[PDB]
Design a protein around this nucleic acid. Structure first.
Ligand SMILES: [Zn+2]
Lengths: 88, 49, 49, 292, 1126, 96
RNA sequence: CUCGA
DNA sequence: GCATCCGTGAGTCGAGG
DNA sequence: CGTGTCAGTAGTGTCACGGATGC
């Protein structure tokens, strides 16, 4: 039916990264206010996407230790974000 | 070339029907060639650039 | 050949460029404009930069 | 002229055999994208139909070679593969071009580089830029020669990230995220903040056609109500700008070097004379000369 | 009085010349063409009194040309007859609402004739839903009113050209035989004194090769062309000889690659030029040949085909023209001059209207079905065949669908104001299929031709790249069934003007001489001067005896278009500003309330009625019930007809189309009278603007070269306030992970933004919405594998599970604000047929009330345009002696340059209409008012007047009216006989040192408002391929820093500003994001990177077998975050 | 990626250079599947050749997470990086 | 395609 | 050795389809 | 899977200028 070279076809667009850049900046600020253990666990679970046992194998710690560090560090980030007015 | 008959009336007086019709000949082609003359002008300009 | 291919006869310049295997020293206004360098003119020359 | 061609292949060390191809490269798909349409159907670049026709005829030639088909079919097939690659690289160069649906000539790979619509002139010599706007121009006699009046609504979006920065500094907004929502919603605090932002931050005004360098000049922005751009009456000669519906573009220099180039090199008050003749341009020209 | 025929308001005309013929139907061009196409009873009765015997409609003509269909044997036959239509499928407004096509089903009678079985089965076969033309002269395709534009094409016939050679500098000649359909044939004499012929663009054969192939002996050729030495040199320099030799020579150049048989070329050389299958000269094409060659000029037009005699007479016409001959008679033919043709002359340039343009597409669609018929005959059995089985209507309806859907002549209707719509329907376009390409049109096709007098307007035409290619039909002009444009003239018997009026074509006009409309004429009819200004063939104007005038013009405005005829004092404006005045009148915006102009021309009445945006009474009667919703008329016979008002409807261009009743309850109204008027209409007249009090003076520089100063009264009293309506639309589809649903529940949105929504997620009627407000709340399910690492962490640190949907709601675009006036919902669940893959569709209509703003573009009727530079308070405005402030301050400098004195004369007459006048009746009628009608000697304040084009008020009478202007309520005359008045500076109080010209001028609000034309962008969407910002305001894109603008940066030496524009501010993928972070962080602007567009250029040069590499200073090639594998 | 590199060299592309660039041959003439929107294997949009449609998402659907970064899938032959590679990975047609 | 400078 | 014919180029920006 | 009474183009009003192409 259509050809992109042919007129009358809308060109593909990509939105700006403003909202993503601002979220990344706020995440980086709340990340700096975390302990080296908690920061090096959320950056290995969400930034590197590993499994719970993968981070446990890397850091040389227990399985539940990674579960507990992630469980608190998440709430610690929610504390810092809600203290700065980040929308739920 | 100029028409062997001039537009004797002034715009204050008011041109006749035929005087107006013969005036539009040069008026339209005056606007018509201005687009082509600007095209060759901008073409010579970007060659000089 | 980059300043020429953007002027006129794009295919005619690109053919002779690949045949002669010409290498372009990116030191010119039109070239640095394309690649994003500071133009070697005005505030872009090494004296003021 | 024959030596001109032969000597190049001799000295350079590249064989002339490259003029005959055994394999043709395929441009990555995102440069020949196929988009979906709101009617359910699809639409692909003409390069895909040219690549598809080369693939179709090359696979049929592989069938004829395997089957031992008569030399008349194989040779007449090899001819069509030549015309297909010729269409992929430069359709229409030899003979009549490969028409698509509706007798439209398909755009070849070389068509992406040719002329005003080519890659060089359309996307390299000139580009579309962020931090810019456009509106109708209106004469402003009260303005000084180094000043221009731009609408408040234009300045807010033009200085949006700077406004968000000051909204979070003065604690009108908790975080930069809500500061963005405040500018998008136009909370009344931004108009007091925006005045602090545009202070002595020059902007560039432009009216096409940009014939000479004074077709773009720098000005000091002044927050004015309304939706029109207020231009100084003396720079009207440089822009060749009358006020019968004209529009001008505004560009905001961001870096410190760019603002300095506008403050010193491009300021309207520092460019009174014509660079072509040395005689002034920002002088009484119409009503002003009659008044004097 | 002016136009005392429908019951209109009494506008008093400054008319010294009577109107012999009243303006025809301005919509006849679109109407009559379509009535002939479908063979309506009105067209048939019109042709009946026209003298026609057995007339045939366009559809009947297609069916007769097609019938019959036969195979090679003749054992099977199919025929068609009796085309008829059932009632229309859906009303006009229902099609606009549901986005369908206005059409009526077409029935025909088809039958199969079997010669080998002797029996026939006849029945009725439905052909297809046929698009119907509305009463307003428009079609409705998918709910949008479109206009089929009449096309100017080269008429069929034989045409001759006198070209000058480039190298030898000798006068050459060429011939073209352009058929109405089929292959082309062009003879020519090159610079070597030899004659040749190109057949269907193919190779140029010697002219005797064609003569030998037709069966002409080499002796009879010398007998016919012996009087010229250039033909003796042609038969001598000829290569091959023989009847069966040159016939194969033509075969191998026309159809290469095929075995040449003496009868395979004998077959095509008969079918390509002499069989009605693959060649046809229309009745006009045959007639144009029978006149150009001077043969069969008496025989009834029965030959629909080219003949061999015509080919010989054409070569005879050419060879005589080459060697200076000026006269020729074909053997057995009438005498005819030997000359070259203009091809721009309106006798050789033909206009095809709506019916023909549709008929040709029907003809092509029928031919595609005919091939299906012949194929279905030889496949199916010869006894179970019915007309239903042989007919596949798919290519037929798809051919008319292809036409109305995609065509340069099927155009999106201009709907700024009623005048723009009427002008668009009367447009004559040279562009399009069969006409010419814009690249293939020189400065000769576009300029004015002397045959355009009274046929196409020499003023109304765009000034852009389409100048000359698009014209407007003259007022009194019409189209004959041949395709040429006729214009009426007054037949002068023996130097005596007669009321007998006859329409003449272009070449018919050249065979006579006509007198100018404003000729001094005796009350009996005899010309006052022996010598009168007379137009002659080839555009010659000269005096000539009164006993030589054959005809004369009907009206002075006979040469201008309807919009051009609406400019008062047009004879005092140059053609440049007059063009802009007519082009900008079509750009006027329908205001909230409309005022008819004080200074008019009389054309405003008929232009408004014929436009079709008012409501005229069909039959005489009384008003039974009147409401803002509908008007009911009780006829004399007893029947009732109710007209429904179109209230606050969006036009094609966002303007407000709003009709309002005029009559009240119990008002006797005649037939054809305006009972209600729509946009830009006041009491039935075109009200494109308002009457504003104007002062001609510079004012503190705020009106500096074409700038305009306005009184704030125009804002407080909604004088230049207009209504604008925008259409917003969104749909809920089926996606890969579920289905988009329209719901009020939107993730992470407060109950405050959703407060203006109902329970469905739709904004409620009446709610005022700014930009960014939610109109339709739609959510789309997004997959888990599509989440950002930060977004998945942000989802974990907020505990909000089950939010697998994202926000894709319909929000208000930047720059929009107004009241929601209407909602339309379409749901697949509720039997509404949506495109496959859609579950819900919502359309929201938002209306804004736009007051006049700073920068809004105003203009007059004389091409005097300008933007609003300053709107001062009412007290700041210079006010007259009695305190009434002026409304608009126009600069004086922009008046004597443009040569548009009409605005000055309108200002004078505008005040005289505002105040009134009384001529001194004592001691007789003064010497300046002797020519004025007695109705003009006394005028009341706010009187309406007409200044017809090339007639109307003269400066002697206008000067006399200023001397007797009526006093105000206090009894004081504010303006002087000069037309100037004493003004007071509202800012200081001191009176202005000199009197200033003050009056009333008609100003129009053009559709160029800052509310639309303002735009700005920090960041936003980027084009996916080039990674550069989008274009256009609607796409929220940035401005384009073009090639010339980069030269300006380099001329300044602003290197860093140039690098900044071309990198971080454009297509630097990582630079733009780090710049935005550096701004919100308060850091410094980082260093620009490499443009992504340059990466694409390299990757494209690679696809062209070019090994491009970037080398460092040492010489090693460096990659760009990529590698290469094999 | 600094912005100072002196020369930009152009030359004839050997048929062997075309293979050095190409991440695989485009055998079939098909484009995609007009239901699943998944590109057909060895087609003009093959993910084994040019790259994944979505980031870290393969064709056969076995590897959809980021933890398997850089794995060449054995069942569909697609690498697992971002779709940015679909703007720079070249293909080629081997002529008979 | 159509229009604005 | 020269007339022919092919290929090259033909202002900038903006708005709605 | 196999196919078979002839089965016949689209589209047609730019131009200046230089130099390789061609009888
Ligand atoms: Zn896989």
């Amino acid at each position: 039916v259509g050809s992109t070279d042919q007129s009358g076809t809308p060109e593909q667009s990509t939105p700006d990264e403003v909202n993503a850049a601002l979220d990344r900046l706020l995440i980086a600020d709340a990340l700096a206010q975390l302990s080296a253990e908690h920061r090096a666990v959320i950056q290995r679970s969400y930034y590197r996407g590993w499994s719970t046992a993968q981070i446990a194998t890397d850091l040389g710690i227990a399985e539940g230790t990674v579960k507990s560090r992630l469980h608190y560090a998440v709430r610690a980030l929610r504390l810092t974000l809600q203290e700065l007015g980040v929308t739920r | 070339e100029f028409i062997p008959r001039p537009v004797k009336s002034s715009f204050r007086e008011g041109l006749t029907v035929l005087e107006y019709f013969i005036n539009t000949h040069g008026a339209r082609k005056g606007l018509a060639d201005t687009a082509l003359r600007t095209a060759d002008s901008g073409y010579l300009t970007r060659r000089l650039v | 050949w980059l300043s020429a291919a953007s002027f006129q006869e794009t295919t005619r310049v690109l053919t002779d460029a690949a045949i002669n295997c010409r290498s372009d020293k990116l030191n010119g206004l039109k070239e640095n404009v394309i690649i994003g360098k500071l133009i070697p003119a005005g505030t872009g020359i090494n004296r003021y930069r | 002229k024959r030596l001109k061609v032969v000597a190049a292949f001799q000295q350079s060390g590249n064989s002339p055999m490259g003029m005959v191809l055994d394999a043709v490269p395929v441009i990555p798909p995102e440069l020949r994208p196929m988009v979906q349409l709101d009617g359910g159907r699809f639409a692909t670049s003409d390069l895909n139909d040219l690549y598809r026709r080369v693939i179709n005829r090359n696979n049929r030639l592989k069938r004829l070679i395997d089957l031992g088909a008569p030399e008349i079919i194989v040779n007449n097939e090899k001819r069509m593969l030549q015309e297909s690659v010729d269409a992929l690289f430069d359709n229409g160069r030899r003979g009549r071009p490969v028409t698509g649906p509706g007798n439209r000539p398909l755009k070849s790979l070389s068509d992406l580089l040719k002329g005003k619509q080519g890659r060089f002139r359309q996307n390299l010599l000139g580009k579309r830029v962020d931090y810019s706007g456009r509106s109708v121009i209106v004469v402003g006699p009260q303005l000084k020669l180094h000043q221009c009046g731009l609408p408040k609504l234009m300045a807010l979006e033009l200085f949006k990230p700077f406004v968000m920065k000051r909204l979070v500094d003065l604690n009108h907004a908790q975080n930069i995220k809500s500061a963005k929502r405040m500018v998008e919603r136009q909370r009344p605090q931004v108009w007091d903040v925006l005045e602090e932002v545009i202070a002595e931050h020059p902007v560039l005004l432009n009216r096409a056609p940009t014939l000479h360098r004074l077709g773009i000049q720098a000005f000091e922005p002044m927050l004015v109500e309304g939706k029109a751009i207020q231009l100084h009456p003396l720079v009207c000669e440089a822009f060749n700008a009358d006020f019968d519906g004209d529009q001008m573009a505004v560009h905001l220099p961001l870096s410190a070097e760019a603002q300095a180039e506008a403050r010193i090199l491009m300021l309207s008050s520092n460019n009174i004379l014509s660079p072509a003749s040395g005689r002034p341009l920002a002088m009484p020209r119409l009503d002003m000369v009659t008044g004097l | 009085s002016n136009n005392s025929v429908p019951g209109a308001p009494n506008r008093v005309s400054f008319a010294k010349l009577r109107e012999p013929l009243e303006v025809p139907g301005l919509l006849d061009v679109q109407t009559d063409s379509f009535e002939w196409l479908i063979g309506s009873p009105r067209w048939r009765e019109s042709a009946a009194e026209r003298g026609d015997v057995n007339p045939v409609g366009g559809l009947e003509e297609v069916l007769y040309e097609l019938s019959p269909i036969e195979d090679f044997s003749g054992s099977m036959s199919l025929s068609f007859s009796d085309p008829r239509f059932d009632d229309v499928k859906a009303p006009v407004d229902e099609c606009k609402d549901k986005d369908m096509t206005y059409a009526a089903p077409l029935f025909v009678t088809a039958e199969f004739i079997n010669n080998n079985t002797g029996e026939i089965k006849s029945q009725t076969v439905f052909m297809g839903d046929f698009p119907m033309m509305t009463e307003k002269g428009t079609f409705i395709i998918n709910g949008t009113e479109r206009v089929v534009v009449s096309q100017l094409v080269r008429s069929p016939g034989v045409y001759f050209d006198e070209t000058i050679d480039k190298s030898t500098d000798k006068t050459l000649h060429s011939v073209k035989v352009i058929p109405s359909r089929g292959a082309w044939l062009e003879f020519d004499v090159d610079k070597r004194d030899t004659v040749g012929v190109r057949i269907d663009r193919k190779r140029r054969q010697p002219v005797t090769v064609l003569l030998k192939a037709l069966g002409w002996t080499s002796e009879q050729i010398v007998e016919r062309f012996g009087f010229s030495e250039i033909m003796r040199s042609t038969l001598e320099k000829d290569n091959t000889v023989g009847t069966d030799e040159a016939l194969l020579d033509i075969y191998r150049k026309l159809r290469p690659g095929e075995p040449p048989t003496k009868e395979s070329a004998q077959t095509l050389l008969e079918n390509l030029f002499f069989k009605e299958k693959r060649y046809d000269l229309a009745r006009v094409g045959r007639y144009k040949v029978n006149k150009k060659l001077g043969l069969h000029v008496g025989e009834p037009i029965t030959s629909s085909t080219l003949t061999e005699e015509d080919v010989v007479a054409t070569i005879e016409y050419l060879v005589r023209l080459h060697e200076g001959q000026t006269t020729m008679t074909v053997p057995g033919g009438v005498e005819v001059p030997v000359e070259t043709d203009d091809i721009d002359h309106f006798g050789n340039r033909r206009l095809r209207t709506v019916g023909e343009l549709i008929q040709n597409q029907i003809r092509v669609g029928m031919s595609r079905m005919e091939r299906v018929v012949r194929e279905r005959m030889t496949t199916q059995d010869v006894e179970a065949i019915t007309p239903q089985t042989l007919i596949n209507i798919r290519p037929v309806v798809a051919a008319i669908k292809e036409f109305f859907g995609t065509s340069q002549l099927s155009q999106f209707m201009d709907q700024n104001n009623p005048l723009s719509g009427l002008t668009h329907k009367r447009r004559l376009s040279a562009l399009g299929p069969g006409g010419l390409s814009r690249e293939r049109a020189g400065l000769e096709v576009r300029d004015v031709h002397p045959s355009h007098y009274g046929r196409m307007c020499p003023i109304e035409t765009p000034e852009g790249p389409n100048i000359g290619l698009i014209g407007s039909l003259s007022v009194y002009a019409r189209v004959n069934p041949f395709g040429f444009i006729e214009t009426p003239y007054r037949k002068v018997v023996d130097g005596v003007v007669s009321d007998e009026i006859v329409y003449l074509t272009a070449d018919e006009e050249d065979r006579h001489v006509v007198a100018q409309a404003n000729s001094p004429i005796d009350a009996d009819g005899r010309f006052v001067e022996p010598r009168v200004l007379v137009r002659r063939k080839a555009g010659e104007v000269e005096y000539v005896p009164s006993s030589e005038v054959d005809y004369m013009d009907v009206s002075p405005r006979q040469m201008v278009s309807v919009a051009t005829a609406m400019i008062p004092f047009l004879e005092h404006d140059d053609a440049n500003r007059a063009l802009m005045g007519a082009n900008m009148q079509r750009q006027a915006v329908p205001l909230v309330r409309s005022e008819a102009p004080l200074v008019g021309t009389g054309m405003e009445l008929r232009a408004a009625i014929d436009a079709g945006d008012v409501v005229v009474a069909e039959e005489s009667g009384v008003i039974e019930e009147v409401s803002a919703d509908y008007i009911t008329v009780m006829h004399d016979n007893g029947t009732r007809r109710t007209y429904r008002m179109r209230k606050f409807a969006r036009s094609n261009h966002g303007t407000c189309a709003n009709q309002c009743p005029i009559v009240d309850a119990g008002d006797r109204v005649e037939a054809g009278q305006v009972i209600a008027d729509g946009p830009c209409t006041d009491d039935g007249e075109m009200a494109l603007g308002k009457n504003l009090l104007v002062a001609i003076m510079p004012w503190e520089g705020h009106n500096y070269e074409d700038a305009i100063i306005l009184s704030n009264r125009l804002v407080e009293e909604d004088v230049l306030t207009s209504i604008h309506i925008e259409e917003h639309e969104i749909d809920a589809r089926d996606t890969k992970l579920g289905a988009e649903e329209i719901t009020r529940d939107i993730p992470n949105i407060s109950d405050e933004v959703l407060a203006d929504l109902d329970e469905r997620g739709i904004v409620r009627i009446g709610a005022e919405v700014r930009d960014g407000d939610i109109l339709v709340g739609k959510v789309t399910p997004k997959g888990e594998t599509e989440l950002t690492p930060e977004e998945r962490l942000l989802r974990a640190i907020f505990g909000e599970k089950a939010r697998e949907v994202r926000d894709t709601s319909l929000k208000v675009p930047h720059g929009e604000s107004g009241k929601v006036i209407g909602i339309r919902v379409f749901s697949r669940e509720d039997e509404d047929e949506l495109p496959a893959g859609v579950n819900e569709l919502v359309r929201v209509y938002v209306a804004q009330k736009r007051k006049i703003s700073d920068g809004d573009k105003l203009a007059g009727r004389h091409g005097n345009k300008g933007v609003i530079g300053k709107i001062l308070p009412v007290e700041d405005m210079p006010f007259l002696a009695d305190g009434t402030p002026v409304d608009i301050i126009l600069n004086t400098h922009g008046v004597p340059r443009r040569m548009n004195i009409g605005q000055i004369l309108e200002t004078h007459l505008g005040w005289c209409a505002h105040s009134g006048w009384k001529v001194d009746a004592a001691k007789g009628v003064p010497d300046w008012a002797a020519r004025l009608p007695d109705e003009l000697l006394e005028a009341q304040p706010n009187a309406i007047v007409s200044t017809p084009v090339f007639d109307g008020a003269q400066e002697a009478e206008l000067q006399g009216l200023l001397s007797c202007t009526l006093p105000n309520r206090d009894g004081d005359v504010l303006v002087d006989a000069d037309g100037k008045a004493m003004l007071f500076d509202g800012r200081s109080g001191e009176p202005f040192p000199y009197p200033v010209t003050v009056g009333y001028m008609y100003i129009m609000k053009l559709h160029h408002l800052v509310d639309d034309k303002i735009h700005a962008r920090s960041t936003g969407p980027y084009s996916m391929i080039t990674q550069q910002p989008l274009g256009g305001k609607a796409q929220f894109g940035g401005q384009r820093f073009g090639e010339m603008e980069c030269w300006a940066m380099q001329a300044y030496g602003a290197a860093y500003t140039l690098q900044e524009l071309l990198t971080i501010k454009s297509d630097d993928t990582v630079g733009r994001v780090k710049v935005y972070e550096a701004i919100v962080k308060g850091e410094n602007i980082p260093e620009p990177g490499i443009p992504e567009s340059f990466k694409v250029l390299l990757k494209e040069l690679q696809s062209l077998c070019l090994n491009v590499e970037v080398l460092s200073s040492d010489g090693a090639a460096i990659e760009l975050r990529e590698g290469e594998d094999e | 990626d600094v912005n100072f590199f002196d020369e930009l060299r152009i030359g004839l592309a050997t048929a062997e250079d075309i293979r050095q660039w190409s991440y695989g041959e485009v055998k079939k003439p098909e484009t995609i599947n007009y239901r699943t929107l998944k590109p057909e294997k060895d087609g003009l949009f093959c993910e084994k050749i040019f790259g994944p449609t979505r980031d870290w998402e393969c064709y056969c659907g076995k590897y959809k997470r980021v933890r398997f970064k850089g794995i060449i899938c054995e069942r569909c032959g697609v690498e697992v990086t971002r779709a940015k590679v679909r703007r720079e990975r070249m293909g080629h047609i081997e002529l008979a």
